[model samples]
Target: SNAMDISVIDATKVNTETGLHIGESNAPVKMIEFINVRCPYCRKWFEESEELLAQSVKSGKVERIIKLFDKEKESLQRGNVMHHYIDYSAPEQALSALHKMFATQDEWGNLTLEEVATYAEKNLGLKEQKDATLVSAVIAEANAAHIQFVPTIIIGEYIFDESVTEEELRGYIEK
Candidate 1:
């Protein structure tokens, strides 16, 4: 029996519950991103990569799993609340909300978890949760994966650097 299969990154089988998956489920290429809602670099990645990333997802070339990375108590509290918003909504809905959150970072970056949750309830209609379970669970998964970067992107066994260009992002998924 071959043992090499053990090291292979199985797209359909990893972190199924903790991360929010977007794009075609059966897409041959799967990518994982670890990001924090309040992280500026994560916001920049969303801003720069979104246009192409959205297209790739729609065309069925790639699927992405998004996990949270919050090292501090305050951010973890906020992140857990955000994760709840994602968990309670549909995949595409959650993605859209994430995109909007990144776009309006200046407005909500400093708000407390409750304030953000309350606003989400009124403005976006995403049901708020006071739950803390998701943060620990999600962070545990990231820790297991040895994720050290705020906007870490992983495709297969390769971890991309921050300098990855949008043009190269297209190539990675398409290839």
Candidate 2:
């Protein structure tokens, strides 16, 4: 007899209440989304997905949901420059500045990995080397399954399309 073994990203270990990993536990549905923070469509999905996800979460209909991704330093660094030029250039800053990067994502829409690191350190209290290493790990996990699409959402056995409507989302959970 022969057997096959597979590896999976453990949702329980990566998610927590106080961290960037935000979601509900013990709900019927779980969503795992892989998206680039710099992608416009991804941003739109982020903006739209949050409301519906929150509704499901508040109603105790979803369990273990999270959005995560990784990129090279190029995009991140450029994102920081764009943030500085369009928002603030304060040498001393952190999360608020990073928030600005995420807030006005339109400006830094296509930031590289380095640009992201710059943005993080300049505003989000992350050192370049440390944060970059952390980001690399995230990217590896995301790419482990050859994930190429931004905002790839895995809901239960099906990886859903972003075009899904809120009603459809609700229907999914209800199933």
Candidate 3:
């Protein structure tokens, strides 16, 4: 006797538009990134590649996309707060705020979950939690991709981890 199971969504079939994105809507390429807001390596990578990313995003050929892999409070809260800028403010405003968050992500070393929310309220005038659906959806896709750790980037057919160098990313952008 044999049994058949349901056909499932393939991991590689993940839609690239599932995350928050910026830059040219018709760009030929995208730098789809996954990170946890409080993750050290993600911030470091952001610091290292900020200019390159900024330039690439502004270029007509590429868009910068953001996702999250960690479901912890720090990641969720910051990400949720940022949704205000992403949805309401102009594109540059959101991108700038996004950069600012990672720019000083170190200050969160001792912030509790509630404390993080308070910080967002005080700093960004944000208190909503509307991203519950988007957060869960992206995390579900992360799981399908078997994303083990955060700070991952998908450029075309390649999956680049946080350890990927700026030069390598530059190469991808150039190509």
TM-score, candidate number 3: 0.79
**lDDT per residue (tens digit) for residues 33-74 in model 1:** 878876777778788887888888888888888876656656
TM-score of 2: 0.59
Clashing pairs in 3: none
Q: Tell me the whole-model lDDT of each prediction, alpha carbons only.
A: 0.67, 0.50, 0.64
Best by TM-score: 3
Tens digits of per-residue lDDT, candidate 2, 59-102, equal 87775333335444455445423322322123224323434556
Off by over 4 Å in 2: 1-20, 72-101, 110-137
Best by lDDT: 1
Instruction: Give a tens-digit lDDT track for model 3, residues 57-143.
Output: 676778877775545564555544444334423556656666766765756434666566666667655545455667777778877
Clashing pairs in 1: none
